[PDB]
Design a protein around this nucleic acid. Sequence first.
DNA 1: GCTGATGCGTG
DNA 2: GTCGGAC
DNA 3: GTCCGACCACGCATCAGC
Length: 621
Amino acid sequence: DPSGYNPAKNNYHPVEDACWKPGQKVPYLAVARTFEKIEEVSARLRMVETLSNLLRSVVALSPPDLLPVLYLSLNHLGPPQQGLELGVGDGVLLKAVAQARQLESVRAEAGDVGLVAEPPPPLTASGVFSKFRDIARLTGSASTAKKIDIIKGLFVACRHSEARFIARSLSGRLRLGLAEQSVLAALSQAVSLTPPGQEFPPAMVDAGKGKTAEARKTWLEEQGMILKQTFCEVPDLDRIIPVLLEHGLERLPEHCKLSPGIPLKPMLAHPTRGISEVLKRFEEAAFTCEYKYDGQRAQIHALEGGEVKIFSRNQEDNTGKYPDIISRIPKIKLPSVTSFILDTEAVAWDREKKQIQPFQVLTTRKRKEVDASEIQVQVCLYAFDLIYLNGESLVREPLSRRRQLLRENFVETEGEFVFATSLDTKDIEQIAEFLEQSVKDSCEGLMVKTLDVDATYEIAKRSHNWLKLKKDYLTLDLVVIGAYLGRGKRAGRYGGFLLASYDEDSEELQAICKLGTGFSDEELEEHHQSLKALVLPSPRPYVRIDGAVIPDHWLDPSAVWEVKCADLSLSPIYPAARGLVDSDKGISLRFPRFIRVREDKQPEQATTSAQVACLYRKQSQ
DNA sequence: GCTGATGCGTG
DNA sequence: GTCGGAC
DNA sequence: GTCCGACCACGCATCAGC
């Protein structure tokens, strides 16, 4: 019966076309039949609709199962502030699949571990979700063998395509072409066509029957926006879905409101090609340029009562990471400030030298540090936006209003709390001077944001309303030494390449980084046909990769390619220019990207390791 | 008790 | 984080 | 333009195997 569930049929009847009786639990084969339908198409509009159909039947037949199927669709375990980690990777999964042959026999890997995984009672969407959370809670000695027993049990109770999606979910890559934005769209459409909370049989099955083409289309877009904006204020399905089922989507904003202590999605940013693009994109609109600091974003929450909370860009609870900010919280606020959401950037600060350390020094800090004195790498917050002030939300306020509120209610404590360096002007000469000074002041670039025109703190309108003017968006010449196999959208062809530089004194090619972005499918096919006969079974003696990942296809060094990167970093695993700067660490590329092939050059004529050292030395650090 | 492997988050 | 693909 | 999934380096935290 559930083998024939087709949530992609025309005139889908949520009750008759369902595959489970009302009041019963949604079987996992139902959501697995839906997944197979979503991955068989490419248009998101047909993806959002096929999902949405399953969400109708769930809202009508088994309401309490809605939250589990949404998370199973999102491939998540709950709200990000919780932090439940699966702790299961490819190795753990392969072991569980064999216990249902041999680990070497299961080492086929197509690309996709689900295909390799392909009497008990049938599986349940809630039961599978509770088993996923059980796996996540398993910690301590022999916790792995406990996880593998649970996973082993799932694969035995799997049927049809259940084995390929359970394995995909646990591996962390469902690869459905459907993510959070379409899941919300499918949910908003679902509850608008089938309202929740109807006595069975539901008096309304399809609330878009008596509407025109423009009517339903415009209606569903307005309904989706009410849900999308509220999610951006409360990204917590455990907090939205109970309210959604109780009071409809129309009343959802009246209860799920932007509150301190509950994280909210921050304003993203889109890269600007140059000053010409930011001037054209912000035509006749005022624009302020700030210094994009190179650190980790800190969302400082000040709940009414004194409890301080700190979240990350992805709503991860970072309170235990910054006890110093939890202590210095009152030093940055004014007496009238009773509750506030500060949008700051946490960068490493050397209190002795009064300078900002690079990003790597920030990452050497402890994640769960109960000892405040044991914190060596100090931090200084750079506040650049305010989203809340004394019981009031500032989402619908322009940037000029939020800026004047931050500057008039927060004290600049030099060395620990300083406002971001800003410059409000339109002269192309002043913009270049501020851009050159930002790199001179140890910053990655310049942020460009409006002050009044489309300058509110609203994600659903445009999550990428801010502009990023980084210097690398305005290069090295390295040889290939090997190729890697592709996974997912890269199966059957090449996925990443390992590049190397030429050490003149050592007379050996030294691996400097891997390269897996910046090329089209036609260029990747041109790379395959060109670097095909160069396949070598063993590495050449002049090649040296040190601790880098051994390429699946050793290549005869003969291809010189141009690679651009953001920064040069000291590498713990690469041998490029080891000893030239650090005694035991080489040099690698931050954010590498492929540019073009240099057919005019040979491996001998490429970026030397001595050059890589000089480039790293002339890097403001 | 330690270490290598690795999961997973940060960009 | 950067990037291209499909729509 | 949006949304999504390819891919990059690197750091802490965890744990099986020893």
